[PDB]
């Protein structure tokens with residue numbers, strides 16, 4: 001079928017910077033013809049080539065095109081000019097989950113349960129497509145205007161059929177084997193649940209090396225104020241042996257994870273249609 005013609009920079013009014021890395025910048029843009037807002041990721045070709053990032057850029061475009069689920073930032077279009085590639089992404093107006101953790105300190109049980117359930121439901125979808133995120137963290141779990149999650153940042157994803165993520169959420173197997181699997185994302189999930197409840201990531205230290213040391217030793221502990229059922233769930237995700245994490249294939253997948261007592265009151269069928277709890 002015929003699709004709309006390529007967009008170009010002049011079709012947009014660019015605004016504020018939404019996010020930044022050493023190889024790309026995400027900028028809010030309003031499409032003039034439609035008044036729609038997009039988060040446009042701008043990548044300078046020369047720099048990407050120079051630093052050998054072509055496979056990562058290609059990976060993100062491929063992944064984010066293929067995903068069709070409300071809990072994921074969508075890639076709507078791409079275009080380029082002489083110097084730059086542009087990716088038109090969903091604009092998640094409320095920004096990072098990290099911002100909310102910092103703002104409110106830690107989440108109550110109702111909010112922890114709901115947002116954890118959305119993240120689990122997103123991973124079920126992603127893993128069902130044979131894709132591993134590999135760098136899941138509250139910085140790339142965004143919140144849309146309606147306060148549902150939208151997960152982004154897929155250049156480092158792996159597609160089943162090399163790279164080490166953010167220190168605090170790195171799984172032990174990446175430190176001891178250099179090998180990621182679906183279960184690496186479930187480890188990150190365990191860290192994120194811990195952070196929602198405690199207000200801080202479970203493996204913390206003065207520098208990267210010391211964090212990694214704690215991870216491989218499973219050296220962390222729970223505060224006294226930690227929802228007991230949430231603690232049990234986290235203990236079943238933060239497991240050194242990757243084949244023993246709740247939710248992984250060797251543990252028979254998402255059924256037993258979603259059945260965990262922490263999720264008792266959750267209706268998994270239509271989370272996106274439910275109204276999120278007030279933070």
Ligand SMILES: C[C@H]1CC[C@@H](NC(=O)OC(C)(C)C)CN1c1cc(-c2ccc3c(N)[nH]nc3c2)nc(N)n1
Pocket residue numbers: 018019020021022023024025026039041043053056057060073089090091092093095142152153154155156
């Ligand atoms: C962290 C941020 C900058 C570095 C970048 N790293 C990169 O491009 O690495 C390469 C190697 C070049 C591939 C990953 N990046 C992002 C950022 C966002 C994003 C951010 C805020 C948003 C909002 N408010 N609405 N929508 C949003 C989408 N979305 C994607 N997909 N990526």
